[PDB]
Design an enzyme around this catalytic site. Structure first.
Site, mmCIF file in Angstrom:
data_model
loop_
_atom_site.group_PDB
_atom_site.id
_atom_site.type_symbol
_atom_site.label_atom_id
_atom_site.label_comp_id
_atom_site.label_asym_id
_atom_site.label_seq_id
_atom_site.Cartn_x
_atom_site.Cartn_y
_atom_site.Cartn_z
ATOM 1 N N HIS A 109 0.821 -1.196 0.017
ATOM 2 C CA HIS A 109 -0.006 -0.003 0.038
ATOM 3 C C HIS A 109 0.852 1.145 -0.237
ATOM 4 O O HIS A 109 0.165 2.404 -0.464
ATOM 5 C CB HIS A 109 -0.957 -0.008 1.028
ATOM 6 C CG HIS A 109 -0.337 0.343 2.531
ATOM 7 N ND1 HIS A 109 0.110 -0.985 3.241
ATOM 8 C CD2 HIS A 109 -0.399 1.234 3.371
ATOM 9 C CE1 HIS A 109 0.168 -0.733 4.292
ATOM 10 N NE2 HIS A 109 0.313 0.952 4.522
ATOM 11 N N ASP A 117 -0.291 -7.782 1.685
ATOM 12 C CA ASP A 117 0.088 -6.397 1.679
ATOM 13 C C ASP A 117 1.647 -6.186 1.716
ATOM 14 O O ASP A 117 2.396 -5.342 2.068
ATOM 15 C CB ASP A 117 -0.249 -5.764 2.847
ATOM 16 C CG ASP A 117 -0.257 -4.298 2.677
ATOM 17 O OD1 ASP A 117 0.222 -3.733 1.875
ATOM 18 O OD2 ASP A 117 -0.928 -3.609 3.808
ATOM 19 N N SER A 140 4.289 2.337 8.741
ATOM 20 C CA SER A 140 4.202 1.152 8.228
ATOM 21 C C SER A 140 5.505 0.636 7.559
ATOM 22 O O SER A 140 6.014 1.415 6.898
ATOM 23 C CB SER A 140 3.019 1.345 7.143
ATOM 24 O OG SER A 140 2.915 -0.006 6.618
#
EC number: 3.4.21.90
Length: 157
Positions: free
Chosen positions: A34, A56, A108
């Site tokens: 992402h 992901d 992240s």
């Protein structure tokens, strides 16, 4: 003084903001899918990345050289406290939890690791459960296979 190898790298957006991180671990450079940006590194940014949407994750192979400057994952991890950039993380009943107001954009990608230095998980997002944030992560089980924990109301960072 702290001298630490070449393992955690910045992922920047169009105008250059840090929006995530990429890490060298187990022979591969890896970053959350992402996070749409470019790895801030002259060699790493040119590699061919393989997309793993079910987790992901987006990874490419570490050049022969860099292979020595890398983390190491770990399957067995009991409850208790762990480490990460912003301090103590907390494994509790199958889910990691950090204080509210700590996690955010750009967090992240960074690893959660033990005191021995092994990577337990990699952060992707967080859902606030009142006073603590439950973390959505890519973790791994006993026989290798990676798992992907994702709390209810998780908003990917």
């Amino acid at each position: 003084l702290k001298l630490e190898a070449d393992r955690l790298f910045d992922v920047k957006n169009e105008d250059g903001d840090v929006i995530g991180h990429a890490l060298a671990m187990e022979g591969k450079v890896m970053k959350p899918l992402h996070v749409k940006g470019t790895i801030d590194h002259p060699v790493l940014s040119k590699l061919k990345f393989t997309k793993s949407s079910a987790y992901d994750m987006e990874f490419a192979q570490l050049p022969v050289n860099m292979r020595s400057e890398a983390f190491t994952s770990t399957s067995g991890h009991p409850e208790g406290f762990y480490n990460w950039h912003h301090g103590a993380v907390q494994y509790s009943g199958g889910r990691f939890t950090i204080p509210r107001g700590v996690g955010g954009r750009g967090d992240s990608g960074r690893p959660i690791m033990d005191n021995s230095g092994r990577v337990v998980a990699i952060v992707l997002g967080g859902a606030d459960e009142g006073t603590r944030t439950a973390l959505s992560v890519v973790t791994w089980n006993s026989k290798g296979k990676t798992i992907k924990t994702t709390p209810e109301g998780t908003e990917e960072w």
